[PDB]
Every structure is written in C-alpha cells, then in structure tokens.
C-alpha cells in the first residue's frame, strides 16, 4: 500500500534493521572446569561474596596463564570489594609477554541474584564495553546462575548494548565499535549453550518492538506499519492479511473506524497468523493497541478533572505483538495456532474527525456513546476483540498502553493484568516469571460497571466520575468478549524507559513465553 | 440536500419519532362532583393538607365502590403523610371482584404548588408508571390547580413518561409498557378538557426539541438538521426556505460564514414561516442558535479567559423548531411567525477561521474575532440582521450563549435581555403561563466601551469584563437597528443534568408568546 | 481539653434503636405467615436478565396468596435493586404491606450486590411507619453473607442525629425466612456486634473537628476501654519525648491540642497463643501544614478513619471476647496545624528508632505518625502488626472507592488479611511493595526521605517508607484512602472494623473447634 | 573531535610508560568527561592505578 504524503520529503516506510551488530557477535560458551584463557580483548569476572556486605573479591576460577594468575592472587585482589555495580580494570602481561586487559564486576552479597540486580550488573558491563575499542569480551561466571538467569543476562546485554542510529545523520557516534566475539566461562557449559541463540532471538524481538516504538510519527503510520508487518510475515513464512477501510465497513467496525475518521492515512487492520504443521491443540489471539499518533482528537474543552493522557507511546502493544510474531515465527513452536492482531489507526484533529457525544456502533452491534475522543485506545480495542473472538480461539490476550493511572497503581516497573478467567491470568503471571517481565494481577471490580450505563446508547465509552481508569477501561473491554477466556495487560507505565529515553520493548518475551509454555 | 460522509457507516439523517406512545393514550376528564369510579389499572389521588406540614392523608373525593371506599377510610390512611413527592400503592378487590391498584402522591402543605413542586409530583407519578404493566392510569385531583397548571401537569407527565430509545441497539428495555388510557377527575372538569390536546401538542413540541438536542453530532449536522426542518414544514404545510452557502455569500453573512468555514458540512440557514389566513396583526421572528457541534475552533492557546463547558449548542434552534410544531399544529390567528436558525459547525481544520480575524457582518459592521469559541454570538449577529430585514414587530432569539448564566440564575431560570420593556414584559408573562421560569436581566450600557476595537468596528468579545452574559447581549444589540428585540440565554437551563437528558426548554415559552395576543384578546 | 462555647467531648450513642429490634429466623420450608408489618421477598431470575418476578413460597393467607400469584407478579421484574411494595388487607382485615426486592439474574450475589438490595430495603423502611419487617430469602446466601446482610441493614438503617437540634419510627421486630434457618441463628447477634463496631467508627469519623481532637478522642477511647474492661494507657507528650517519637511529635508541634498516643489492650483469660498490634492513623484534623507553595495532592479529610476502625474493632473484640489472643489497639493521635510552632518542609527529624527523616512535604503527615507508631508496636513483641490508614490519594486511581489495598512484608500475614476480607465481605486487594522504587527515598542529607520527589506510585512509595520502621516482624499495611467515605450517601462507611475483627478471630475460624 | 588519547608527558617508570603507549591509548577518546583507569604494578612491583580524563 502506498503511503500518502503532504510534502515530497515525507518518508513512506519505517526503516528497520534486521541484521544488527549484535547478530555479528560470535558467542562461545566454555566450561569453567577447563580453566580460563585470556589473550586479546577484555576478560571480566562476575564475582560476589555472600553474607559479608562489601566483602572482598576473590578469583576462584582457574586461569590458564601463570602471569595473569599471579596478578589475580588473593593478596592482590583483597583490596577490592564486591559492591553491586562496582567495576575495576587491570592491565598486565600474559605468558606470551603480550598486554591483556582484565577486570571484574561486583555482584553484591546475595548468592542468587535477582533480575533487577543482574540488570544492574549488565549495565556496568555495558559501561566497560562503551568508549573502549575492544574486539572480544570474555565473561567468567564465578556466581551461581541458572539457565533462565543466563538467558536474561544475554538478552539484557544484547538489548542495552545495541544503539539505535537509524535517524542520526550528522551525529553518528564516530567512536562506537562493537565486539566481534563474546566468550562465556560457566560451569556445565553444555547446559547453557541452548540458551544463547534463544536469547539472541528474544533480544531482537524486543529490539524489533523498540525500533517500531522509537519510529517517529512522520515515518510510522497505519500504512507504513502494516507494510512492515507484511514484510515481517514474508520473512518468516507467516500468513498475513491487511484489512482496508472497505472490508472494515463490511465488518461494521464502527468504533475503530470512528477513531481513524479524521486521519490522512486510512485504517489498516493487521492480521498475522502462525500455524503449527501438526495437530493444533491451542488457539491464541494476541491483540495489540496500535495508534501510530494520538492527538487526542476533539477533546479541546475538557471539564477540569477530566482524564488526562500524557503517555505518547500508543502503539507499544502492537509493537510487542509483532515482536512476539518474530520470536514465534523464528522458534516455530508445536501444536499451536497464533493470531497476531492490531487495529492500527491515527487519532487526528480535522474536519472529518469524530466528536465527543457521537454514538457509534461496534462490530458486535453494541452502540457506544463517545465521552472523550482522547480515550481512543479502548474504542479500537473493542472492535479488535470482537474480531479476535470471531476467530474461535481458546485465549484472547490484549496488550496496550491504555491508562495513565497505571503510573499511580504499579508505577514504571510492573505491568498490570486484568481478565475474565483465572486460569488464563495465572498463565500470564507464570509467563511473567519466566520472561522476567514483571506483571501484577489487578481486579475487574464489577461495582463500577454501572458508571458505564449510557442514557441513550447501549454503553458509555468512559466514566464521568470514577477515577479508577484502568479498571473502568477493563470493564468496557469486557463488554466485547462473550465467551472466551480473555486477559488485558495494561503496559502504560512500563512501555518507555524514561531514564534511558528509549523503549523497553516490554511484552515481547512475556507473550512469547506464554505462547511457548502453553 | 445530501449529507456528506467520511466513511460509508456515517448516518445521513436524524431519526425522529413522530408517532409516540403518548399519542396513543386516550384521555378522559370527568367531574369530581360525581365521584370517582375504580374498575381497573392504577388510580392515584393527588392529596395535600394545607398548613399542617406532613399532615395525615385524608381522601376528600367520593368513590363509587364500597371496597375501595373504606380501604381509603381515615383510620387506614393515618399512617401516611403528605410530604411532597411521597407515594404509596394499595392492592385490593373492588365491588366487581376485580383487582385494582390505588394510591396517592403527597402534594405538601402549601395550597399553591410551584412549577418545581408540580414537577416533583409528576416524577413520583411516573415512578409508579415505570416498572409496572398498567393498561390505564386515573388521577384524582384533591388539590387546586388552574388551567395553565393542569396543562403543565399533563405536559410534564407526557414528557417524563416518554423514553428516547432511538440509539439503543442491544440494551432496549424489554419491560417497557405504556398505558393506553388516562382518566382525570377534577372539579369543574369541563373547563379543563380544552387543555388536554393543547398539552399533548405542547408535549411533542418539547419532545421534538429533546430529540434534536439528544441527537449525536454524527447524526445531527447542518445538512441533516435543515432536512428535518423541511420535513417538519412539509408535514404542517408551513412555508420553508433553506439558504445555502452561495446565497449566504450574496447576503454577506460574513460572521455566520466564518464560524462554519472549517466544517465538513456546509452552512444551512433555516427559514420556516407560519402565516395565518385572516388578518396578519403581528409579525414575529424567532431566532435559535444552531451549532450542531462546537469544538471551540482555534482557541488552543487561551490566556489563563472565558471557558465554555456547555455542549448543547443547538438547543435554541431546537426550541424554535419545536415552537414551529406547536404553532403549525394549533394554527393561531392574526399572526405571521418566522422560525430562523443559522445552522453550522465550529470545527478545527486548515480552513477554519482564527482569533484575530476581522470579518464583515451582513449589516456592514466589521468584527475583530477575539475567541473562536465565542461562535454563538457571531452566528446570531447575521441571523438578527436577517430577521430585522423581514420587517417584523418582535425579534426574539434563544441561545445557550454564556456559561455565566450558571453563576447568575443557575439551572432553573433562564435570563432574558432586551431593548424594549414592552417585549420583555410579554416574555415574562409567557414564562408565567408556560411555567418555564425566566428572569429579566439588564443590558448595562457602561460595559459597551469594552467592545471598542482598535482596528475593526467592534470587538467580538471583551478581554476583561467577566459579566459575559451582559457583554454578549451588548454585542447582539449592535445587530438590531430599530426593532423591539429580546434575547433569552438558556445556557444554564437547557439540560437536565440529574436525568442526563434535555429539557426542551423554550418550546412552550415561545408558543405562549406567539399566543400572547389571543391570550390578551377580548375573545379569551 | 483546651478551648479557643467550644465543646470538650465527643458525643457517642451506645444504645441505638437497632439494639431494640427483636430478630427471629424461621425456616422457609414451613411457609411464611403474613399478619402485620411489611413482608419483602428477595427474588431473582437466573434465566432472563430483568426477568419477571415469581414467588415460590407459600403464604398462609388467601388474599396475600392471590396477590403473589404468578399471573399477578409478572408485571414486575427482578432488576437488581428494583422493588415494589403494596398495602392491602389480609384474611383478618388487617393492613399489611407485601412486596419484593429484585436480586438480579446472577445466583451468587457479591457484597456490592447485597448492598444494593439492602439499600432498597432501607428506602422502604425510611418511608413506611412499620412495627415489623419480614424478609423472605428466595435466594441463596451463605452464613457470612447473611450476617453481612444484617450488619449492612442495621448500619444503613441507623441515622446519626447527634448534631441537629432543630432538624430532628424504627421497627421493633425483624423476621427472616430462610432455608436451613437453624444454621443462621448464630449470625444474628454477631451481626449486631459487628454493626455497632462499624457504627461506632462512623460516629468517630463523622464527629466534627471542633468536637474531635487528640484529647477528646483519647478520652473516648478510655471510656470504651472502661466499658469493656480493657486495659488502657494514654501516652502524653513527656512520655513521647522520652521514647523519642520525633516524627510523630513533629506533626503535632503546631497544634493547640497536644499529642495523645492511644494504647488499648484486650487479653484472653486462658493461654495467649497470638499477639497482634493494630495501628490506626489518627489525624483528627489535617490542615496540610506548611505546604503553602506546592506535586502530590492531598485533598481528602477523613484522616482518623484508621483509628476509628481500630477502636471499632476494639468494641467487637471486647464484646465477643475471643480466646487465645492478646490484641493491642494503637493510634498516634495528633493534629497537623499551621502556626509559628509548626514543623516545616526541609526539617530533618529523628524517629524513635534513630533513623533521620528529611521532611519534603508537611502534608504527608500520615506516614510520619505511623512510623513512630510502628516502632512502638514492634517493641511490644507481637506476632503480627497491621496498620490501617487513609494514606495515599493514589488509591482512588488504582483500586477506586470499593476495594482497599493491602501491602506487607509477609505473605502469610497478607493471605490472612485476604481471608478476613472474604469472611467480613469488606473487599481488599493485594498490591506489591516494589523494591526498585526504594532508591527514590535516599535522602542526600538524612537517612531517608519522607517522600519521593518524582515517583507517582505514591501508595507503593509510602509502603516502602513504612517498611523502614518494622525491623523483624510480620507486618501488613491497609490503605483505605479510597474506601473510607461513602461519597454518594455523604457519610462514613466504617470500613475495616469487621475486616480487622475477622482477622483477630482468624485462629478461631481456623481452629478444630 | 572525540579523537584518540595521546599522552605527551614522560613518566619515570618503564612499566607504566609501556601502558601509556600510543597503541594502547588510541582505544580511548577524549570526549569531555570520559575516563578510564587501570590497575597495574610499577617498576618497584607496587600497585598503581593510572588513567585519563
Ligand atoms: Ca547490518
Ligand atoms: Ca499501545
Ligand atoms: Ca385539598
Ligand atoms: Ca443553543
Ligand atoms: Ca453603536
Ligand atoms: Ca388585546
Ligand atoms: Ca391470618
Ligand atoms: Ca460457628
Ligand atoms: Ca486514617
Ligand atoms: Zn496516549
Ligand atoms: Zn488517548
Ligand atoms: Zn458551547
Ligand atoms: Zn463556544
Ligand atoms: Zn488527608
Ligand atoms: Zn495530608
């Protein structure tokens, strides 16, 4: 589909890098029992000291170099402590009279490191990688880590290491270089090799979502985003269908169409499908909110105390769903059929836009009274959920930066999950544990349903008084699923890394673990 | 006129119900002197007890049924009081071994009920009608009401009873059931019968206005609204004319055209006319504000300035069209009435007008736009010039103009401004007989200097004076040269916020105003 | 109690008209007698939403039976909360009122549904002069929900008239027809105790600020302890200074009424197997202090609802007298006023556990008083510490006005609170203490910040602050800021009394007996 | 701009002198505020840390 333009300098596609410098890093896992070699690059020891806070660093691994081992003797290393995040660099000559660089990163005093602590360790590692022209990094695991934490280590290292420069012209980092080799020394190395390429797949699925979220609104629009989804499906041999306005009118998607009425780019409904070769025992629909730009629409004279929308990353749900499509299409799980859905549109201000007070008819026949054009996410999700249920699936899971109220409930670290089915909710919480993307279960409080009782339409779009917006929005969405287990993940608080000024790609690993472990 | 759309699902007409269940209710008025018959349905006594606040219930009327007669004995009724709005239901078998339902609604302790009090009585009555599958309701008046208050009772009963379900798809009330018969027992009943069908006419004019106000902005637009006005004129054999953009440009309606510049629907000026057959003794122009949707326009960077939170911006046009129904149905003598509305949309687009624009009205005066969200007075300016060019005796406009009305008179009383005391007093008399409350407010000429533009002839708005209802009145007055004119600001009273529905305010007020010569004629 | 005609005590009504209602539970299988008063059937229709009303019970009156026939009753529907009642003559030519309350189409009513049913009943009770009410249960409710029905009926029926003189009736009998009626009789008097504990808390919360102050509130707590033979101690400023309660003392520095620390104790006669400290926030008036150039907003004024819930729990516990428990009822009561002596933003104060706190907002006074109260609670050597407080307005955006939030450092204790929420039918939802936000409380000059300058998850940050004042004891924190006040009815809910009492009774409810 | 690090001063220690060689220091750049420090033994077998800003 051709992307409309106002000026000839308007771009018509989203630049996407599929082969990243992370993909060019050769990773080798060696067993720690055989001793550690040094030679070129940087060798970093991950050391802890359980119990003793700020205890001394002691190198436990055998090093296959006499000169290096003499520097790492306990007498020399006891001057340093293992405080979480601390790092040091050492310069020395090896047995072949060549200069090598060695160091360590402190891993604290807890024997089993948490995801947040490991994350801080990775950030200290990335700091050592930056502003240094290394060709190889070697990481020696002198701490206890299981298979999942090792995968999380690689995913986080890969993601934080990668720098998005698609939109730098004259300000590209002239000194940035990427290592070409990553060595890992760990006990039972054969048991961790299986996680390396899985981490690489999980990394790019997250970084792919990040590339879409960080794409500016003059590059990303309903036409260009659906084009990228088609490209992705063709690369991975997925079935794809993009529904245009004419078909959406036939399906009577009045809520989704109303939101996009005032845009210069027409609505595009993304429908990707992965189908296993053998018997299908599980059918899953993943629905992502996909507002490429949310102006708020005709909400220019809001009564004071009206719901405010300050979160501008309004297709993070679509990005996470498409990033999950990358992982699923690459890993090719068995016995499952997955539908990747997003009602993509723009929410613009023009003479053609929908208005507050409009009464629109959704694709399930329910009429909706519009109370706020800036509550556009739940309107597009309503028709997407009806479409999902008509596919006849076992589970419907939607993910969306829906309500800013999440910043006041769970904050910037935990996403919230709502749903109509306890078994499905528990599966999301289980996938949250193994994906290491935190999720907390929040209730759909039915006492608030009465605030959506419209005087003229079947239902109100918004509540005029109840401030629990995340719960009210869930109650609205629930009206568009009759009889299918459904869960709703509100990622409005966790989608964007405000400290680093970049997306998190939140939801890719969560949704992939949900698809794979089911 | 064809209604433009963005998508195929965009509606192209306003759904309007003309034949309502209220129209199927057969009404019979009987004299209370002969006693009340009880035979079926629900029979409700309107009882008061003057002076004795919350006094006991005592039925004064004779009942032609032994079983009902002494269920209603004082000994049985003394556990109940007459607090305004309270109600009770009784079940019994009558002398014909049939089950009947009897009850009362308390009417308080003051003999003369106010318009607000009567509304509370009607609402309690409607509560008994709802959630009950009755075929007939009988109301026994053991209170004193004049003919106007009796008519107001019926209008309010009909209006509150009616439920607007035009936009319910999957949530239509399945238990809805309307009575088919209404009996009324009142003293001197023969003098009240003529009020029955007048109340039914006044009811639908009000409900018609309500249907237009409650119509969503994606159904109601300048094209679809003028289409409905044409339909209404054809049903009632009224003359009609709809002015399009080309004719409006020839008339130089620059203020009205500027507001609609950024709209997707073109401006449509509605002009309906009722003319009596006999002598025409009074010519009247009724002007209604008709903004089908008011986005505020390019008011995106207002100074930390007047705020507009009232979103029912064509209630004035709706009241004028509802008045056209009543007048076209009742067909009064000796009058010629013009029903006018400059209908448009106030949208944000590349084509919209801007603050700081200087536009030329149809009387040649240049206006400096200070706030695109003050669009109502701009459209009314050209409509008033159009009205005066018709050569009428009275010009009356009605509009949800200024939110300041909420701070002056509140949600119950509309405000009337004008340049002619005789006309203002006639509006006040119409308020009394229609029972739609209106209060006279002054046009303070000392504030006129705040509209002195440095570059144009006049400012659209004041930059500092907070008495916006008066300033807006001063602005409108600049577009009536030498004709008696009154301005009814209904911004505070148009919408029933507790019930979340329109009031249809102004329909009965304006119709009584039209009938003000017949009401003050020797033949009355 | 100093005066600035200023009242010196909180008026409390102990003997309410509800206590005069005689309650009888009859088994529905024997049929319902109708002879006097108002008889209401609680009916549902699990089939058709808003379906017709159908009365199943047999009535021993021909005229009332003719009214309750299916042909006559289909004119009414079962929409939740809808009701109709009619007055008629029975077989003995006596005036009776018969009707129904719609219970919807879902078989299992929630606490919110039961509230709507009760409100319809109370509306008829307030608008009918009756000597007796009879309620016929043609719906299914368990024993806890039946008790909740009675408690809510009693509480909503009661009208607080302490403060009208010129703007100044109640049934004497309540009949209940229900299946397996013998299993519900024990709930009647428990409901009456739970009702007054809730109404007692309501009387304290609704007490005006010129009646309720730290002196008059602690005086009321002493009266309550004396009435119920509870041990009591009221700590004054001098003792609080000896305990170095610098955070609690700072909040009350600018007040005209001095700080008063309430400490009530219930101790079982037999073996004491569980020790519990219940801590309630008790700010009798919160002006916000020197927060004149404010950013977190604090807009709601029901700042001793936690103390009221704790004292209302003390009534229930002192009345029911459970075994094997020792309960401490604690509240650091104070005012937060503006004067030349008030504490200021930027103050660094030392709490009773030695930790220095940098004050960032004098309007965040609740957590400061709770900090010293929690240190006091832990020094008692208890098994569980549970605090309850209208702490953060952010609760209105997370769980709303119906569900309270519980935070804690011990999953066993949190799960017991959730159990108590289920059996008390006062809804509570578990929320996490996210330790990633702890760094936002790292003060540059003091040991810890009072508030976060940027993190909007205020309910979690406040929990992280409170956690710094419980060293090694199972502790839970119930934020009732959203649920304390019934905004539609313009009155308190008394939220937490029944929840906390069920929590105290959690060893008995999970005992072999 | 952001060019490599080049040490101009002579240091009176042979072991550290080799660390500050151009080949070793060109892996670092002079962006304002950037820094690296390494730990090593000097000519007298004593631990020293040297670095740049
Ligand atoms: Ca490449
Ligand atoms: Ca999103
Ligand atoms: Ca009378
Ligand atoms: Ca209007
Ligand atoms: Ca002039
Ligand atoms: Ca005359
Ligand atoms: Ca009997
Ligand atoms: Ca028991
Ligand atoms: Ca409190
Ligand atoms: Zn947004
Ligand atoms: Zn939005
Ligand atoms: Zn307006
Ligand atoms: Zn306006
Ligand atoms: Zn407060
Ligand atoms: Zn406060």
Author numbering:
A (entry chain B): 86 to 603
B (entry chain C): 86 to 389, 391 to 610
C (entry chain E): 88 to 91, 94 to 257, 262 to 387, 391 to 609
D (entry chain F): 138 to 190
In the authors' words:
Although overall sequence conservation is low, M17 aminopeptidases possess a conserved homohexameric structure wherein a dimer of trimers encloses an inner cavity harboring the six active sites.
Overall, the quaternary structure is similar to previous PfA-M17 structures with the hexamer arranged as a dimer of trimers and the domain arrangement in each unit consistent with previous conformations. In the new conformation, L13 loops of each of the six chains cross the entrance to the active sites and extend to the active site of the neighboring chain in the trimer. Site 1, as expected, appears occupied with a Zn2+ ion in a capped trigonal bipyramidal coordination geometry, but refinement suggests that the position is not fully occupied by a Zn2+ ion (∼0.6–1.0 occupancy).
